[PDB]
Subunit: 361 residues, 3 copies
Amino acid sequence: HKLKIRGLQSPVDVLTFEGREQLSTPFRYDIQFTSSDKAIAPESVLMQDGAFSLTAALRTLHGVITGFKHLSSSQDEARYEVRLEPRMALLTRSRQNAIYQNQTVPQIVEKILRERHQMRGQDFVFNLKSEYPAREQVMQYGEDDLTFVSRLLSEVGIWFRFATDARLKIEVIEFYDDQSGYERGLTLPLRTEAVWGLNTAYSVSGAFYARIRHERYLNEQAILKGQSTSSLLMPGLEIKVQGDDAPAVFRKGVLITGVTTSAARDRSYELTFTAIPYSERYGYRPALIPRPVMAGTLPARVTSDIYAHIDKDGRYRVNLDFRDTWKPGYESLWVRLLAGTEVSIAFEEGNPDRPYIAGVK
Amino acid sequence: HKLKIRGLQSPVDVLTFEGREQLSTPFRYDIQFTSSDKAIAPESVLMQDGAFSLTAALRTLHGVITGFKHLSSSQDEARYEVRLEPRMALLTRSRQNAIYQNQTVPQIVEKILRERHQMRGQDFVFNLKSEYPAREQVMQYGEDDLTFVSRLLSEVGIWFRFATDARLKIEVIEFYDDQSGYERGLTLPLRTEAVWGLNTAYSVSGAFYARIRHERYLNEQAILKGQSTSSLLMPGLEIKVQGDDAPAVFRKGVLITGVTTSAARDRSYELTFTAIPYSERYGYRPALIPRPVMAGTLPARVTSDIYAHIDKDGRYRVNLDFRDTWKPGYESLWVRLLAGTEVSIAFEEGNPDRPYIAGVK
Amino acid sequence: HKLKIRGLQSPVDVLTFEGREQLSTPFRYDIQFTSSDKAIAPESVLMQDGAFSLTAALRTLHGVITGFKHLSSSQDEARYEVRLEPRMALLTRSRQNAIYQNQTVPQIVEKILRERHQMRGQDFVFNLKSEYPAREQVMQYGEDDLTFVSRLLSEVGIWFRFATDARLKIEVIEFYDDQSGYERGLTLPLRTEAVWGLNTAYSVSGAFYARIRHERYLNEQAILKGQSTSSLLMPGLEIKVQGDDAPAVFRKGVLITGVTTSAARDRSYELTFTAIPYSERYGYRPALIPRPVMAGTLPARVTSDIYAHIDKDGRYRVNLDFRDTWKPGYESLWVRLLAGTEVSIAFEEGNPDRPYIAGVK
């Protein structure tokens, strides 16, 4: 196992690591290492590019260094820890309010990626099978970019995984909405690279929304688990098992939804995985991130020059920037004389996408 | 220890178990077992009846199988787990909005039991000492049936336990509101069946509501704990201790509020219990389940033909079904011309039982 | 280690203890002891004064006994536990609604201390460097006194620590807002009293509010940790380390923000500490306690005799006591004919300090 952090002169020798990967969430890897340098400075490491590999060259994680710890010091070395996350994790660092106008969910997501985060088409790709309606207005309020994006994708049942661009040496976010996004198709073993410890758990547009919400129920109705030494095994992969003392579902084919991941100099590579059965009548769907709850009222100013900007439904266009908490040109809201007047905006059942005027101040 | 699941041909041999019982909450038992059948299918087990006994025949838990796990497989056997809960636990599976009209808390609770859950008079029994007022309107909004029912009972300080019908072979919910619901009266031992490890912890209509809320404070002011091998020891039982190296409270008499419960083929039966002192000036009271917080507004339609249905307080009768999220005939609300008109319903301090018109759309 | 609880005849012999101290929060010490008395009664102990010392006389914690446990009994002794907290912790026991009129944050805090809690100038001291504006109205709603006070201090970035009055034998709350509140200046060791196990972690009026919120970001950007046997080491202390195999920050000087603390008869004294670097361009700032979220509306009565109490902004003075949930003379609110009339009070974006009339009942 190797860890390369760009610009770092200090030798990096991997002691131990713990990793977590899961569909529709950015991965996280806490990597311990030793170095002859007993004073690696956080500034040399934080926000730098990082690459973490399993050596045979087998699989690499590309990302940024989010956290840095100096753990201890000996006579001749020091112990350190770094957190390696993809660049997508950095969307948690920005939380501005915005109203997005006439977009589909993907277009909003692509905007958030490209505008605030400088991501560039090589950094992500959409392979959606379904078609997504334009939404008239979509509000982001009191939500970091990651939460906002993940909520929008989950409500409509789009999911993502990370993949590696061999040439560019970067991680790429790939979005999908159906089973044609699954990667086929390894066949392990039981138990060189193999599978073992297999176990199961079972518990008890539109339209569309009813279809997505049913597939999500089916998702959490059947959890498949197991253990492995395969360095190829990853979220997004559809695998099957040789067996044949393995349960029936694992012989049909299972879709890996998650892995927990580990090694040390005296232990080496083992992973536990979560999974769901392959099926032709449902697909993977992420957990629904709850909507923000809009209690109380928002002040706004009616805009125009100077009678009222009012379209063929009335339906004022209202402006709610006062505190630069609003993204530029994303402050304006179409809502149901006077008009430079201050109004109160309320939200039907706390829903940010059902605003109305309450409300004149 | 025996586990019988109705309809199951596969032999069931109990490996290990962990159980939890507590007043005013449905019990939960995770039971591991081995079987010669290396492919018990979830469909043979989920939603089937289950009975779990301590053998001398000593005590049985009746309920349904909620969860199923295949844990591992050997050459000749497989290891499995099931979750055994009473039928009441299944009230968590239904979450419809409803307004209940002119009922007492017990009548509402009985309705929820009988209507949506097919429970039949043998399945539950009320032995209340206090008298409960009819409530004009009571709203269930964004709450599963279990949460709703438990909240209503707790706000008024009614509690329940489970008991066994020997003849019918079923679990029975028994509701009570005072000390005459306690079952008397075992006397253990210290330490064949006995008690040990005794310990204490002390920390720092109406009317009525002040009386209930005081008794609840007294409930959490004095926690009594201990360990036992008695298979008879259960929530709801009032027991006393022989001693006499046991603290004073345990000699007076204690009411068992909860037990955690365990055995294995190489360990056998032990339980830890929580408890409260017997007293004549207070009784058991469950934890208060918080009210749902009504932020924002609910749309409604004023009904009539066609001027307004309006009684001698005005006070419109309003209808808020649009999305079959409302129980049939439970969609209508009496609230303080025009009238097929759409209004906004708001709630005084977020309370679902204080609605008013805000609010004309 | 000695524990004295006022009025207690039963001999107290300290078995083991676990303690937690941290800036801007009341300390907590769970202290186990043995006694020849096999029936110490909770009433002899709860709410009594308690003093806990490290013997050389080295450092004492003064406070009250909040919790009491009888753990076990032998032939000749019994094991007990007590929780020792300062008197400030008792502010969690009172939760009344109140509107404070024309005060600074410190004056409100001093009021809460003196009025409801009988604290007397010897019990606390303010040494603020910054000047704090009078606030016109400040609402406490659905918040215990501790949460309320801590929220107000944190929003403005005031912090506190506890100190001992040698003569009076009491704990004293000391409030500060800058680096001149730090106590200088021990110099340990590495490793009689010393330091070891040093480690770091780094992650990724006004005006004023932007300045406070930036210093708070810097606070959680760099966590310094370590271990020690010093009985002098405490939150509030600025210490430095001899080294010099110790990292650079620890040689500059670090401010102790927190300690976890332990001993036993067979182990004795060790503490882990958290800390932040000394700096001249930022200071310690506590975590921001979130504001209560005001969903729904509050009923109020317009007061006067009898036309309307209305000052030169209009701007009614409104009264919202109905249920003695309001502190005496703290029920009245200045808010934007008729007037003994009942109104509805709403809150702009759920903020308790932005009330307006919605709203006529």
